[PDB]
Enzyme design. Structure first.
Site, mmCIF file in Angstrom:
data_model
loop_
_atom_site.group_PDB
_atom_site.id
_atom_site.type_symbol
_atom_site.label_atom_id
_atom_site.label_comp_id
_atom_site.label_asym_id
_atom_site.label_seq_id
_atom_site.Cartn_x
_atom_site.Cartn_y
_atom_site.Cartn_z
ATOM 1 C CB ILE A 1 -26.166 4.796 15.911
ATOM 2 C CG1 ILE A 1 -27.687 4.821 15.906
ATOM 3 C CG2 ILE A 1 -25.679 3.862 14.825
ATOM 4 C CD1 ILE A 1 -28.227 5.645 14.732
ATOM 5 C CE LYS B 1 -2.935 -3.295 0.945
ATOM 6 N NZ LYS B 1 -4.034 -4.213 1.316
ATOM 7 C CB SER C 1 -10.745 21.253 27.494
ATOM 8 O OG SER C 1 -12.109 21.024 27.198
ATOM 9 C CG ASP D 1 -21.579 12.148 30.746
ATOM 10 O OD1 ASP D 1 -22.590 12.368 30.072
ATOM 11 O OD2 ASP D 1 -20.559 11.488 30.289
HETATM 12 NA NA NA Z 1 -22.691 7.110 17.718
#
Ligand code: NA
Ligand code: NA
Length: 327
Positions: free
Chosen positions: A98, A64, A172, A248
């Site tokens: 997802i 490659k 941060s 969170d």
């Molecule tokens: Na996702």
DNA sequence: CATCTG
DNA sequence: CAGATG
């Protein structure tokens, strides 16, 4: 760092692909060590053979690197960048909830878009639903100016419910940063540590308040020590409502706050360096503690920390303001 | 790693 | 319970 960039780049494209489209963990993992070693590598890779010479560098990758060095392109990369299937997978994955796995199923069922999704809201679960509902908001960074406003609400509520709570916003945000991706709070309490058999209420009470006042809008996942949700800065005087933001909150035994606080605050680089320095200093550190390193190889016994100070102290180092925790 | 889903 | 997601 810029000497073998393309290479390391294509290598990452390939790796990613194996993992997300194909299921090729082995291969995937292959491309990765490859990019890593070439990365550290000091010279200008001038051909495959030169490369192959490297550990992690086989005949396949070598091949490659050749075509790539030989021509500004790679057919495979070419082919993959078109393929709608591969693309759909890359895209669906952006939805919170997802993953690739899911991304594969959906595609095979023909859901390849945002619309596809709404239409089939039924096949998605709660997280995934929320995640689709705030797709826009979710990709929008969070500006400090809001962060400060967010932080302000959170601390005040935590305080109200218990004067004894200790909250901290890491990330941060904590190291200065102009914007951020999501709000991360570390939470602790005196009445909560290593031994102390639980106290679930500890997290739950706060969460509750946060929704009481309407700061938190949705629950992604609520556990007994980790909360994953959505919040929102009350839209002032109707004309400009704020985007929904990820947030969170996690409960931590007081006996292990600071390391965590230290830890979460990053950056990844600052950590490692300190981590490596700790090691010199006859120590060990990880997300929850700092242990005196025996000589027999290893050894434990959690050294006692009351602040971020104690930590540094221990490894005999310069207390660094979070701003300078860069690298 | 902790939480969810099924 | 495996398996998936963050
Ligand atoms: Na996702
Ligand atoms: Na298995």
């Amino acid at each position: 760092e810029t000497l073998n960039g393309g290479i390391t780049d294509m290598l990452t494209e390939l790796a990613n692909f194996e993992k997300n489209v194909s299921q090729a963990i082995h291969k995937y993992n292959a491309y990765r060590k490859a990019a890593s070693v070439i990365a550290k590598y000091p010279h200008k890779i001038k051909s495959g053979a030169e490369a192959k010479k490297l550990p992690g560098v086989g005949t396949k990758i070598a091949e490659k690197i050749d075509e790539f060095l030989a021509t500004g392109k790679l057919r495979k990369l070419e082919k993959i960048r078109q393929d709608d299937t591969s693309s759909s997978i890359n895209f669906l994955t952006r939805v919170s909830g997802i993953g690739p796995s899911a991304a594969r199923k959906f595609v095979d069922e023909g859901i390849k878009t945002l619309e596809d999704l709404r239409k089939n809201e039924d096949k998605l679960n709660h997280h995934q639903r929320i995640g689709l509902k705030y797709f826009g908001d979710f990709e929008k960074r969070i500006p400090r100016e809001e962060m400060l406003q967010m932080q302000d609400i959170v601390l005040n509520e935590v305080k109200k419910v218990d004067s004894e709570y200790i909250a901290t916003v890491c990330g941060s945000f904590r190291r200065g940063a102009e914007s951020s991706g999501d709000m991360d709070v570390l939470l602790t309490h005196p009445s909560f540590t290593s031994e102390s058999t639980k106290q679930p209420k500890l997290l739950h009470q706060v969460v509750e308040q946060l929704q009481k006042v309407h700061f938190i809008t949705d629950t992604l996942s609520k556990g007994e020590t980790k909360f994953m949700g959505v919040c929102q800065l009350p839209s002032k005087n109707d004309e400009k409502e704020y985007p929904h933001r990820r947030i969170d909150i996690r409960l931590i035994p007081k006996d292990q706050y600071y390391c965590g606080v230290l830890y979460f605050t990053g950056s990844d680089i600052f950590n490692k360096n300190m981590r490596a320095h700790a090691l010199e200093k006859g120590f060990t550190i990880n997300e929850y503690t700092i242990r005196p390193l025996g000589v027999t190889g290893v050894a434990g016994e959690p050294l006692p920390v009351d602040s971020e100070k104690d930590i540094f102290d221990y490894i005999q180092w310069k207390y660094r303001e979070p701003k300078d925790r860069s690298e």
